[PDB]
Amino acid sequence: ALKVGFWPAYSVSEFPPSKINSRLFTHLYYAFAELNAPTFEVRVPPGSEKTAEDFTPTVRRLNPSVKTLISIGGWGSEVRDNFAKLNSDASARQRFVKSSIALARRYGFHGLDLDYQYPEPQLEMENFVKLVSELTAAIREEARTSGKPRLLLTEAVYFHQKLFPWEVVTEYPVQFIAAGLDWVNVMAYDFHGSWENFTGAPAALRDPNSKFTASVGIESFLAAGMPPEKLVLGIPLFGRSWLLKNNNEVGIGAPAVGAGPVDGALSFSEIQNFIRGGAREVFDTTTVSAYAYKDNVWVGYDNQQSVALKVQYAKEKRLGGYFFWSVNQDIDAILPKIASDTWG
Ligand SMILES: CC(=O)N[C@@H]1[C@@H](O)[C@H](O)[C@@H](CO)O[C@H]1O
16 A cells, blocks of 8 residues: 655755655655756755755654655656657667766665656657666566565656547557556646636546546546556645636536636645635535635645545555655644544
8 A cells, every 4th residue: 555745855944854644655755856958867956965864764753663655757848859869869868867866876766756747749758768778677686686575667758648639649568567667656636727717626636527537647547557556646625726717607517717815726735824814715526626706816736635535545445645745835734633533
């Protein structure tokens, strides 16, 4: 049973690793190491070496049996473009594989994660396969030479097995992945947000009149032949916010006029403050989700109830477990506790 949390190093000032309740997790990820083009000598951001080093011993103080992984990449065009440059260059791939393994070992991480959004189109998937093929070979060789247990290898995946459901240009090679990776982190969120001019459930578990749901995505990996234990269901600890066109239209599907605070996203903790400050919270049973609104601000997120429901779902579907992005966004570890209690 995998209980996974992502900690972003950029949150270090407001939420250092010591604040993580690691008793609620089996694995904690450090996000993110840099690809560092053009050499592709992977590294943590220069000047953060101490933070990277202290991460694992720190989180193990509260839970000595917790394991850690370091994630390489992240979202955005720069990371995507750098993966694309890297994967097409055999020499660069060799430098990446060598430096990534060294990076994990340097700081005492138990594994590596690749966060590439996204390996499309077909050429990019094929070249990513080359990278992972070489990385897995090196991981096994490093275990034999060192006498240590091999590093874990995971990767972030789109909510759906096809890239993309509406226009398929490539797809995740599920048998390759099941063979080479310990698990995948399914990003079952950001289905809806301020890029749309209507409010919606940003991480809907299901929806009777929509294909953008966690369940539809999970079903697609399972249909493709992925062993269910290889799938780890992502749950956001943030919500997507909109500014309402009309303050008296406050339900799902209400017209909107742009991103709410802060640039279209609020942490769960910020959403708690929003409610304590007068916002009305609604649970939407149709989508298995929450939303909250006050004046012209509307936010959709996962709450205590929807998280319990999503974790039970993951158990029903026989998944490997769940992950949260990102742990700094729930300062009192409200949702990680509910999730851990639900699975146990
Ligand atoms: C489920 C999905 O694909 N969601 C994406 C979202 O991640 C992205 O931020 C947005 C804006 O480009 O476009 C959506 O289609």
